[PDB]
Amino acid sequence: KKCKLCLK
Amino acid sequence: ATQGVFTLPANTRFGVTAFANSSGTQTVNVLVNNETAATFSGQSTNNAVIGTQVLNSGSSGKVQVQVSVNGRPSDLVSAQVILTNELNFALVGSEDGTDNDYNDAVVVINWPLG
Amino acid sequence: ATQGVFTLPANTRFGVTAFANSSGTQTVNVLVNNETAATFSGQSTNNAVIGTQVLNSGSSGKVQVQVSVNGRPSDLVSAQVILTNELNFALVGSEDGTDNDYNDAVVVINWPLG
Amino acid sequence: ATQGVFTLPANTRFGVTAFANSSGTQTVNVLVNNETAATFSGQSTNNAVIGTQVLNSGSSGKVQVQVSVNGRPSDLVSAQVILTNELNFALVGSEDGTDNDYNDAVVVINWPLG
Amino acid sequence: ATQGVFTLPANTRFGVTAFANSSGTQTVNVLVNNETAATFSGQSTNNAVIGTQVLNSGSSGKVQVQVSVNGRPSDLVSAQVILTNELNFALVGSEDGTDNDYNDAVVVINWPLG
Ligand SMILES: *C(=O)C[C@@H]1O[C@@H](C)[C@@H](O)[C@@H](O)[C@@H]1O
Ligand SMILES: [Ca+2]
Ligand SMILES: [Ca+2]
Ligand SMILES: [Ca+2]
Ligand SMILES: [Ca+2]
Ligand SMILES: [Ca+2]
Ligand SMILES: [Ca+2]
Ligand SMILES: [Ca+2]
Ligand SMILES: [Ca+2]
């Protein structure tokens, strides 16, 4: 989600 | 030898783009300054772009790529190529199985941008 | 020397992907056996993927990348690099102006796929 | 209601062009007579033309546009417009997220050609 | 009636793309705030992209398309269509002769971008 650091 | 680690010029924007060629879902982690900066994930057997991102190389310039499938890290091959002393490519291939085509996740880092 | 022309193994699928880093609109043409097989157009100064596609090298295996801005051919730089004797990259850089950064249109061809 | 499905005159050449306006990589598939006839892909937030192609509507004239982002289908809006009873546009917009701008992939079909 | 003139939201980025379907060389002028902001020229009988660009609607938002073929003004048809109250198309067709197909230069303006 953001932690992770999921990016497109 | 260590693979998937590149020293870029510090505080420089670069692009990172990952393609998938495997029946297993690819997870690509891009680290800058030894910290996760971007994470891609997707599945394709047709070279689909599972992620593309512009990042900053930070104060150290150290960029590292990791690839894993279902928690299992893939074996990496990598190299850097520079054209006309200006255009830089940092190339990564990865292998998650036994056929050794090393295209299961392909990661291209390019700089400078703009 | 001639730039942007690559001999691939015949009848092989390959990916081709174009990035844009210029204020001018980039037009990227991928020819297979001297016939246009893919066209990407777009303007970006942030490494946008103005196109990615999977093509077949055909019976000739001849692949050519052309880049033009406002109808004027850009100057090209290119090379091929092979990792662990299996993973192939064909790389193309292009310059549309006077800064000589050669990232105005960046094309990456990779094979094998699947 | 169904969106992205258009009945063209049979056996007529038509153009199809895809634009991208999203951080996610767009995948546009064009089906003629329920068979995949073209596939465009790219990532841009600046309206890059990730694909353009001339297709034939075939004996059925049925053309369908599909858009997906890393495997997830986008929600589609569509309509057809005819100017001076001769010039046809088949328009498609798509949303891949939550902001509802419906420009993430924009597909324009136009006919007749030549 | 006046054709090819559209009032966009002020200070809004929009894409403009032109296709050609005529043996005559098409000249497309895109005016913003009554000043020429882009000019495309090219010749195709196969719907080829002769130009694409991102522009800003400016303080007035007034965008005008003009098409000429070797000094001869083309007659224009145009309309604007809004899908799901968000996605905008400004469509222009042009006729340079007598066959009344109005595809000789096709211009598609779309917004918003990003
Ligand atoms: C993901 O970030 C959502 C996405 O990308 C934004 C840049 C904007 O284009 C938005 O519309 C798109 O859905
Ligand atoms: Ca493998
Ligand atoms: Ca593989
Ligand atoms: Ca340059
Ligand atoms: Ca540049
Ligand atoms: Ca959106
Ligand atoms: Ca968008
Ligand atoms: Ca005509
Ligand atoms: Ca015509």
In degrees rounded to 5, what are phi and psi of residue B64? -130, 140
Terminal CA-to-CA distance of chain C, rounded, Å?
A: 33
Centre a 10 Å sphere on the Cβ of residue E10 and count the other Cβ atoms it contains: 13
Cα separation, C112 vs E43, in Å, equals 37
Whether the CB of D96 sits within 6 Å of ligand 1: yes
Asked if the bond preceding E112 is cis, omega within 30° of 0, the reply is yes
Residues of B in contact with C91 (CB under 8 A): 81, 83, 89
- Interface check A1 vs B, CB under 8 A: no
Query: Do E49 and C41 make contact, defined as CB atoms within 8 angstroms?
Result: yes
| Residues in a beta bridge with D64 | D5, D31
Alpha-carbon distances of B66 from C65, C75, D40, rounded to whole Å: 30, 34, 28
Centre a 10 Å sphere on the Cβ of residue B21 and count the other Cβ atoms it contains: 24
- Interface check D53 vs B, CB under 8 A: no
Q: How many domains in chain E?
A: 1
* Distance from chain centroid for Cα D70: 17
| Residues in a beta bridge with E64 | E5, E31
Contact C55, C33 (CB under 8 A): no
| Closest to B110 measured CA to CA, from B68, B71, B58, B54 | B54
DSSP chain B: ---SEEEPPTT-EEEEEEEEEEEEEEEEEEEETTEEEEEEEEEEEEEEEEEEEEEE-TTT-EEEEEEEETTEEPEEEEEEEEETTTEEEEEEEEESSSS---BSEEEEEEE---
Contact D30, D37 (CB under 8 A): yes
Asked if the bond preceding D112 is cis, omega within 30° of 0, the reply is yes
Which of C53, C103, C111 to mutate: most B Cβ within 10 Å? Answer: C103
For residue D79, what is the enclosing H or E element?
strand D75-83
Q: Which residues of D78-88 are buried (b: 16+ CB within 10 A; e: fewer)?
A: beeeebeebbb
Q: What CATH number does the domain containing B6 carry? A: 2.60.120.400
From D41, D43, D70, residue closest to B42, measured CB to CB? D70
Alpha-carbon distances of E11 from C54, E7, E57, E97, rounded to whole Å: 38, 11, 5, 36
DSSP D29-71: EEEETTEEEEEEEEEEEEEEEEEEEEEE-TTT-EEEEEEEETT
* Nearest-5° Cα angle at E32, E28 to E37: 55
Asked if the bond preceding B112 is cis, omega within 30° of 0, the reply is yes
Class of residue D37 by CB neighbours under 10 A (exposed 0-12, middle 13-18, buried 19+):
middle
In degrees rounded to 5, what are phi and psi of residue D82? -125, 120
Cα separation, B110 vs D51, in Å, equals 23
Alpha-carbon distances of B56 from B14, B16, B60, C8, rounded to whole Å: 6, 10, 10, 34
Q: Which atom from ligand 1 is nearest to the alpha carbon of D99?
A: 11
Contact B33, B59 (CB under 8 A): yes
Cα separation, B39 vs D53, in Å, equals 33
In the numeric block, the tokens 């003004």 are attached to E73
Which of D39, D68, D70, D72 to mutate: most B Cβ within 10 Å? Answer: D70
Cα separation, C61 vs C10, in Å, equals 4
Resolution in A: 2.1
Q: Dmax over Cα atoms in chain D, in whole Å?
A: 40
Q: Which long-range contacts (CB under 8 A, 24 or more apart) does E71-80 make?
A: E72/E96, E74/E104, E74/E105, E75/E102, E76/E3, E76/E4, E77/D83, E77/D84, E77/D87, E77/E3, E77/E102, E78/D83, E78/E3, E78/E4, E78/E5, E78/E6, E79/D81, E79/D83, E80/E6
Contact D15, D56 (CB under 8 A): no
Handedness of CA E71, E73, E74, E77 (dihedral sign): positive
What one-letter code names the amino acid at D15?
A: G
Experimental determination approach used: X-ray
D102: DSSP letter: -
Residue of E nearest to D106 (CA): E110
Q: Give the domain extent around D76.
A: 1-114
Beta strands E87-95 and E75-83, pairing class: antiparallel
